[PDB]
Design an enzyme around this catalytic site. Sequence first.
Site, PDB file in Angstrom:
ATOM      1  N   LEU A 164       0.864  -1.184   0.000  1.00  0.00           N
ATOM      2  CA  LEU A 164       0.000   0.000   0.000  1.00  0.00           C
ATOM      3  C   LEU A 164       0.882   1.209   0.000  1.00  0.00           C
ATOM      4  O   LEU A 164       1.855   1.240   0.765  1.00  0.00           O
ATOM      5  CB  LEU A 164      -0.856  -0.001   1.281  1.00  0.00           C
ATOM      6  CG  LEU A 164      -1.707  -1.233   1.502  1.00  0.00           C
ATOM      7  CD1 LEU A 164      -2.349  -1.175   2.867  1.00  0.00           C
ATOM      8  CD2 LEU A 164      -2.750  -1.240   0.369  1.00  0.00           C
ATOM      9  N   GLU A 192      -7.031   4.024   9.140  1.00  0.00           N
ATOM     10  CA  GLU A 192      -7.679   3.461   7.928  1.00  0.00           C
ATOM     11  C   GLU A 192      -7.633   1.924   8.054  1.00  0.00           C
ATOM     12  O   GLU A 192      -8.658   1.246   7.882  1.00  0.00           O
ATOM     13  CB  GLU A 192      -7.047   3.943   6.618  1.00  0.00           C
ATOM     14  CG  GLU A 192      -8.037   3.925   5.414  1.00  0.00           C
ATOM     15  CD  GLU A 192      -8.454   2.536   4.940  1.00  0.00           C
ATOM     16  OE1 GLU A 192      -7.597   1.631   4.759  1.00  0.00           O
ATOM     17  OE2 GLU A 192      -9.653   2.328   4.711  1.00  0.00           O
TER      18      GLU A 192
HETATM   19  N1  LIG Z   1      -7.564  -1.186  -0.719  1.00  0.00           N
HETATM   20  C1  LIG Z   1      -6.357  -1.088  -1.223  1.00  0.00           C
HETATM   21  O1  LIG Z   1      -5.721   0.003  -1.374  1.00  0.00           O
HETATM   22  C2  LIG Z   1      -5.804  -2.492  -1.660  1.00  0.00           C
HETATM   23  C3  LIG Z   1      -4.618  -2.550  -2.364  1.00  0.00           C
HETATM   24  N2  LIG Z   1      -4.064  -3.817  -2.699  1.00  0.00           N
HETATM   25  C4  LIG Z   1      -2.806  -3.767  -3.529  1.00  0.00           C
HETATM   26  O2  LIG Z   1      -3.076  -4.370  -4.844  1.00  0.00           O
HETATM   27  C5  LIG Z   1      -1.836  -4.936  -5.365  1.00  0.00           C
HETATM   28  C6  LIG Z   1      -2.316  -6.353  -5.709  1.00  0.00           C
HETATM   29  O3  LIG Z   1      -3.158  -6.265  -6.934  1.00  0.00           O
HETATM   30  P1  LIG Z   1      -3.060  -7.287  -8.073  1.00  0.00           P
HETATM   31  O4  LIG Z   1      -1.606  -7.123  -8.566  1.00  0.00           O
HETATM   32  O5  LIG Z   1      -4.124  -6.944  -9.068  1.00  0.00           O
HETATM   33  O6  LIG Z   1      -3.185  -8.639  -7.423  1.00  0.00           O
HETATM   34  P2  LIG Z   1      -4.352  -9.533  -6.818  1.00  0.00           P
HETATM   35  O7  LIG Z   1      -4.225  -9.598  -5.373  1.00  0.00           O
HETATM   36  O8  LIG Z   1      -5.635  -9.303  -7.589  1.00  0.00           O
HETATM   37  O9  LIG Z   1      -3.611 -10.972  -7.277  1.00  0.00           O
HETATM   38  C7  LIG Z   1      -3.797 -11.366  -8.652  1.00  0.00           C
HETATM   39  C8  LIG Z   1      -3.588 -12.841  -8.679  1.00  0.00           C
HETATM   40  O10 LIG Z   1      -4.635 -13.485  -7.866  1.00  0.00           O
HETATM   41  C9  LIG Z   1      -5.332 -14.429  -8.753  1.00  0.00           C
HETATM   42  N3  LIG Z   1      -6.600 -13.912  -9.253  1.00  0.00           N
HETATM   43  C10 LIG Z   1      -7.075 -12.652  -9.187  1.00  0.00           C
HETATM   44  N4  LIG Z   1      -8.265 -12.563  -9.754  1.00  0.00           N
HETATM   45  C11 LIG Z   1      -8.596 -13.833 -10.137  1.00  0.00           C
HETATM   46  C12 LIG Z   1      -9.714 -14.406 -10.749  1.00  0.00           C
HETATM   47  N5  LIG Z   1     -10.809 -13.699 -11.085  1.00  0.00           N
HETATM   48  N6  LIG Z   1      -9.665 -15.725 -11.008  1.00  0.00           N
HETATM   49  C13 LIG Z   1      -8.626 -16.513 -10.703  1.00  0.00           C
HETATM   50  N7  LIG Z   1      -7.539 -16.004 -10.122  1.00  0.00           N
HETATM   51  C14 LIG Z   1      -7.517 -14.678  -9.852  1.00  0.00           C
HETATM   52  C15 LIG Z   1      -4.249 -14.759  -9.814  1.00  0.00           C
HETATM   53  O11 LIG Z   1      -3.399 -15.593  -9.087  1.00  0.00           O
HETATM   54  P3  LIG Z   1      -2.316 -16.744  -9.755  1.00  0.00           P
HETATM   55  O12 LIG Z   1      -1.324 -15.836 -10.501  1.00  0.00           O
HETATM   56  O13 LIG Z   1      -1.793 -17.463  -8.553  1.00  0.00           O
HETATM   57  O14 LIG Z   1      -3.191 -17.586 -10.853  1.00  0.00           O
HETATM   58  C16 LIG Z   1      -3.655 -13.407 -10.123  1.00  0.00           C
HETATM   59  O15 LIG Z   1      -2.299 -13.547 -10.626  1.00  0.00           O
HETATM   60  C17 LIG Z   1      -0.802  -4.742  -4.241  1.00  0.00           C
HETATM   61  O16 LIG Z   1      -0.157  -3.465  -4.414  1.00  0.00           O
HETATM   62  C18 LIG Z   1      -1.649  -4.604  -3.007  1.00  0.00           C
HETATM   63  O17 LIG Z   1      -0.990  -3.839  -1.977  1.00  0.00           O
HETATM   64  C19 LIG Z   1      -4.666  -5.012  -2.334  1.00  0.00           C
HETATM   65  C20 LIG Z   1      -5.834  -4.941  -1.583  1.00  0.00           C
HETATM   66  C21 LIG Z   1      -6.384  -3.703  -1.203  1.00  0.00           C
HETATM   67  C1  LIG Z   2      -1.791  -4.642   8.930  1.00  0.00           C
HETATM   68  C2  LIG Z   2      -2.008  -5.966   8.160  1.00  0.00           C
HETATM   69  C3  LIG Z   2      -2.777  -7.009   9.017  1.00  0.00           C
HETATM   70  C4  LIG Z   2      -2.738  -5.687   6.798  1.00  0.00           C
HETATM   71  C5  LIG Z   2      -1.980  -5.523   5.646  1.00  0.00           C
HETATM   72  C6  LIG Z   2      -2.596  -5.275   4.394  1.00  0.00           C
HETATM   73  C7  LIG Z   2      -3.988  -5.159   4.290  1.00  0.00           C
HETATM   74  N1  LIG Z   2      -4.643  -4.857   3.081  1.00  0.00           N
HETATM   75  C8  LIG Z   2      -4.634  -5.768   1.942  1.00  0.00           C
HETATM   76  C9  LIG Z   2      -5.561  -3.833   3.105  1.00  0.00           C
HETATM   77  C10 LIG Z   2      -5.326  -2.689   3.888  1.00  0.00           C
HETATM   78  N2  LIG Z   2      -6.177  -1.669   4.007  1.00  0.00           N
HETATM   79  C11 LIG Z   2      -7.366  -1.778   3.296  1.00  0.00           C
HETATM   80  N3  LIG Z   2      -8.223  -0.751   3.393  1.00  0.00           N
HETATM   81  C12 LIG Z   2      -9.425  -0.768   2.785  1.00  0.00           C
HETATM   82  N4  LIG Z   2     -10.238   0.306   2.992  1.00  0.00           N
HETATM   83  N5  LIG Z   2      -9.735  -1.818   1.980  1.00  0.00           N
HETATM   84  C13 LIG Z   2      -8.944  -2.856   1.757  1.00  0.00           C
HETATM   85  N6  LIG Z   2      -9.360  -3.894   0.971  1.00  0.00           N
HETATM   86  C14 LIG Z   2      -7.678  -2.872   2.454  1.00  0.00           C
HETATM   87  C15 LIG Z   2      -6.783  -3.931   2.358  1.00  0.00           C
HETATM   88  C16 LIG Z   2      -4.716  -5.329   5.457  1.00  0.00           C
HETATM   89  C17 LIG Z   2      -4.127  -5.574   6.686  1.00  0.00           C
END
Ligand SMILES: NC(=O)C1=CN([C@@H]2O[C@H](COP(=O)(O)OP(=O)(O)OC[C@H]3O[C@@H](n4cnc5c(N)ncnc54)[C@H](OP(=O)(O)O)[C@@H]3O)[C@@H](O)[C@H]2O)C=CC1
Ligand SMILES: CC(C)c1ccc(N(C)c2cnc3nc(N)nc(N)c3c2)cc1
Length: 206
Positions: free
Chosen positions: A25, A32
Site C-alpha cells: 500500500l 484506515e
Molecule cells: N484497498 C487497497 O488500497 C488495496 C490494495 N491492494 C494492492 O493491490 C496490489 C495487488 O493487486 P493485483 O496485482 O491486481 O493482485 P491480486 O491480489 O488481484 O492478485 C492477482 C492474482 O490473484 C489471482 N486472481 C485474481 N483474480 C482472479 C480471478 N478472477 N480468477 C482466478 N484467479 C484470480 C491470480 O493468481 P495466480 O497468478 O496465482 O493464478 C492473479 O495472478 C498490491 O499493491 C496490493 O498492496 C490489495 C488490496 C487492497
Molecule cells: C496490517 C495488516 C494485518 C494488513 C496488511 C494489508 C492489508 N490490506 C490488503 C488492506 C489494507 N487496508 C485496506 N483498506 C481498505 N479500505 N480496503 C482494503 N481492501 C484494504 C486492504 C490489510 C491488513
Amino acid sequence: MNQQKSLTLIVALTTSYGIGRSNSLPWKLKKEISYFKRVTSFVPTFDSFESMNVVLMGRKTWESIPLQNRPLKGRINVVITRNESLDLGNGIHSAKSLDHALELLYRTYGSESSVQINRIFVIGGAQLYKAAMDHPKLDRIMATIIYKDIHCDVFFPLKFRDKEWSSVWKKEKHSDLESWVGTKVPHGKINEDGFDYEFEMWTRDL
Ligand SMILES: NC(=O)C1=CN([C@@H]2O[C@H](COP(=O)(O)OP(=O)(O)OC[C@H]3O[C@@H](n4cnc5c(N)ncnc54)[C@H](OP(=O)(O)O)[C@@H]3O)[C@@H](O)[C@H]2O)C=CC1
Ligand SMILES: CC(C)c1ccc(N(C)c2cnc3nc(N)nc(N)c3c2)cc1
C-alpha cells in the site's frame, strides 16, 4: 443454495483510482487499517457466538500481507489463484475463482457446521476487484477516498465514482454507512500522514 448472499467490495483508493505500489500500500494509515479491520470483522452482537465474515483476496494481495499477520485474524480467509497450487499457510482455503470460493464456503460452513458465514468481502487486489465488479451478486463498495494523487502502479479497474457509471453506482448517506457498518464512523475528512481521506459507501441495484 449458492446465490443467497450479496458480495461487498472494500477498498482504499486515491482520486486517480490508485490502490497499490511495489506490491503493497503506498500509504501507512493506522486509523484506515483499523476501519478496514472493524468493517470486515463486524458481526451483529446477537450473531457473534458462531458467525464470522469472509475475506476473499487475490494471490498477490495474500503475499502483500506481512507473514506474521496472515491469515487475517477473526475472519475466514480464502485466496483466489489459478494454480492449485503451491500457495501455503495454515489450512488456508484457496479457490480458482470467486464462484469456486463461494461454493467452497457454502459447502464448508454448511447448515450444521459450528461456524456460520455472516458477510463476504472482496478485499483486493485489482485483478480480483475486476472479477468482483463483473459479478452479478456484488452490490456494495466500501471506499476510502484518498485525496492525493500518490504514485501507484496498480489501479482500481472500474471508475465507479465517475460520471459514466453514476446511473449504476450511487453514493449512500453517511447515516446509512453507519447503519450498515453498525457503529459511529468518522464523517468527512480525516488527516493522517499529512493527507486527507474519508469513508464512503456506494451501492448498485442487483
Ligand atoms: N484497498 C487497497 O488500497 C488495496 C490494495 N491492494 C494492492 O493491490 C496490489 C495487488 O493487486 P493485483 O496485482 O491486481 O493482485 P491480486 O491480489 O488481484 O492478485 C492477482 C492474482 O490473484 C489471482 N486472481 C485474481 N483474480 C482472479 C480471478 N478472477 N480468477 C482466478 N484467479 C484470480 C491470480 O493468481 P495466480 O497468478 O496465482 O493464478 C492473479 O495472478 C498490491 O499493491 C496490493 O498492496 C490489495 C488490496 C487492497
Ligand atoms: C496490517 C495488516 C494485518 C494488513 C496488511 C494489508 C492489508 N490490506 C490488503 C488492506 C489494507 N487496508 C485496506 N483498506 C481498505 N479500505 N480496503 C482494503 N481492501 C484494504 C486492504 C490489510 C491488513
